[PDB]
Amino acid sequence: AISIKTPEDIEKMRVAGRLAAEVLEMIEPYVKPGVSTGELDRICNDYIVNEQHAVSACLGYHGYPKSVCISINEVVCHGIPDDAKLLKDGDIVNIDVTVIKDGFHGDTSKMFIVGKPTIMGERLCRITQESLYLALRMVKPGINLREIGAAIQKFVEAEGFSVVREYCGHGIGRGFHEEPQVLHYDSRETNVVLKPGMTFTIEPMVNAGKKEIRTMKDGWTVKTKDRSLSAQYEHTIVVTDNGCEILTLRKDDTIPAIISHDE
Ligand SMILES: N=C1N=NC(N)=C1/N=N/c1cccc(C(F)(F)F)c1
Ligand SMILES: [Co+2]
Ligand SMILES: [Co+2]
Ligand code: NA
Numbered sequence: 001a002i003s004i005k006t007p008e009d010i011e012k013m014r015v016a017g018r019l020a021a022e023v024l025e026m027i028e029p030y031v032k033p034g035v036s037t038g039e040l041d042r043i044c045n046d047y048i049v050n051e052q053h054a055v056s057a058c059l060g061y062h063g064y065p066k067s068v069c070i071s072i073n074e075v076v077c078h079g080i081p082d083d084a085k086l087l088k089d090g091d092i093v094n095i096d097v098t099v100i101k102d103g104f105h106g107d108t109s110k111m112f113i114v115g116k117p118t119i120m121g122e123r124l125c126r127i128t129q130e131s132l133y134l135a136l137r138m139v140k141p142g143i144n145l146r147e148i149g150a151a152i153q154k155f156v157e158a159e160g161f162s163v164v165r166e167y168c169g170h171g172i173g174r175g176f177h178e179e180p181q182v183l184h185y186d187s188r189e190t191n192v193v194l195k196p197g198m199t200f201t202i203e204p205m206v207n208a209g210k211k212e213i214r215t216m217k218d219g220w221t222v223k224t225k226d227r228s229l230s231a232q233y234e235h236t237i238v239v240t241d242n243g244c245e246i247l248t249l250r251k252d253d254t255i256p257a258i259i260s261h262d263e
Helices: 007-030 037-051 119-138 145-158
Strands: 069-072 075-077 092-101 104-113 169-171 178-182 199-202 205-207 213-215 222-224 230-232 235-240 243-246 258-260
Touching: 007 037, 007 092, 007 104, 007 235, 037 069, 037 092, 075 205, 075 230, 092 119, 092 230, 104 119, 104 230, 104 235, 119 145, 119 199, 119 205, 119 230, 119 235, 145 178, 178 199
Parallel strands: none
Antiparallel strands: 069 075, 069 092, 075 222, 092 104, 169 178, 169 199, 199 235, 205 230, 213 222, 235 243, 243 258
C-alpha cells in the first residue's frame, strides 16, 4: 500500500531535494580533466556534512564505502569514487547524490561530459535526459506507471539504444527505497495508478549498445556487458493534483519544476 506524503512531509522533501540538486550544482566546476573521482566524492561529502548539515544516504548503505556514486563511460551505476581514477577528455560521468535532511531523502543524478564531447557520448546523454523528461511530462493522477515505463522504452529503443532492466526508480521518503518500483520499460506486472502525494524517482539507465550488464568482482561496480557507453539522469518528484512537481530541479534543467495538465 503506497505511502501518501502529507503537506508537511512534502515540504521536507522539497528541502532535501533542493539540497541534493545543490550538490550537483556545487560540484560542476570541479568536474574537469585530471580530477580524481575520489576528490570529487570528498568535496561532495564535505559539502553535505559541513555546509548543508545533512547526511549522505549512500554512505554505509549495504556497506557502500563512499558518499556519492560516480560512474564513468561503460560503468552503468554504482561506480566507486577512487583517488586513482582520473577524469579525462571525452568521458561521460554520472554523479548520483542522495541526501537525508530532517528525516527525508532527496535523490538525483546527472551526466557531465568532460572536456570535448564525443558525439556519441553527447547523443546518448541527450536521449537519456529526454527520456526522463518525456516521462516527467506524463506524471499526473490516474496515469499508470506501466504507461510511463513503456513510453521511456519506446523512445530509447527508437534511437538504437537500450534500457537497463535490473535497476529502477523507486518510492522515496523517510526510506531511501520505498514502494513502488518504477520500471523504465513495459511490464505486465506493473499496475500502479498514480495518486496525489506519492513521491518517487524516475532514473532511466540507457546503454548505447545492448541492454545486458555485468557486476564487477568488487561487488558494486556495474558495467555494460558489451562495454558500450551507458548514461543515467534522475529526479525525485511528487505527484500533484494536476501533474507533478520536480523536487530536485537544477538551473541547467530545461523543464519547468511544476508541470500542470489543467486548462
Ligand atoms: N544512488 C542511487 N540513487 N537511486 C538509487 N536507486 C541509488 N542506488 N544507490 C546505491 C548506492 C550504493 C549501493 C547500492 C546497492 F544497491 F548496490 F546496494 C545502491
Ligand atoms: Co540516485
Ligand atoms: Co534513486
Ligand atoms: Na556510464
